[PDB]
Structure 1
Amino acid sequence: FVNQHLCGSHLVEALYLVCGERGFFYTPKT
């Protein structure tokens, strides 16, 4: 259960990296 709140921290690093300047909506509350 902690993996989500922890790995999600790295998912965003790749998200705004792929998006570059574009933004992204991150919603972990699946």
Structure 2
Amino acid sequence: FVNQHLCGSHLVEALYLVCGERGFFYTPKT
């Protein structure tokens, strides 16, 4: 798996592949 800082739409794409059928919550708060 990736060994990096996942940021932006990369971060949402990673969350898209890894969760799959469950889905995800993207909440970008600092």
Normalising by structure 2, we get a TM-score of 0.52
| CA-atom RMSD in angstroms | 6.0
Moved over 6 A (4+): 1-6
What's the CA shift string for 1:1-30, capped at 9, x where partnerless?
999999321101010100112211101122
Normalising by structure 1, we get a TM-score of 0.52
Number of aligned positions between the proteins: 30
Q: Which runs of 5+ in 2 are unaligned?
A: none
Percent identity of equivalent pairs: 100
Compare relative contact order (CA 8 Å, sep 6+) and give the higher one, 1 or 2: 1
Which of 4-13 and 17-26 deviates more? Answer: 4-13
Q: Which runs of 5+ in 1 are unaligned?
A: none
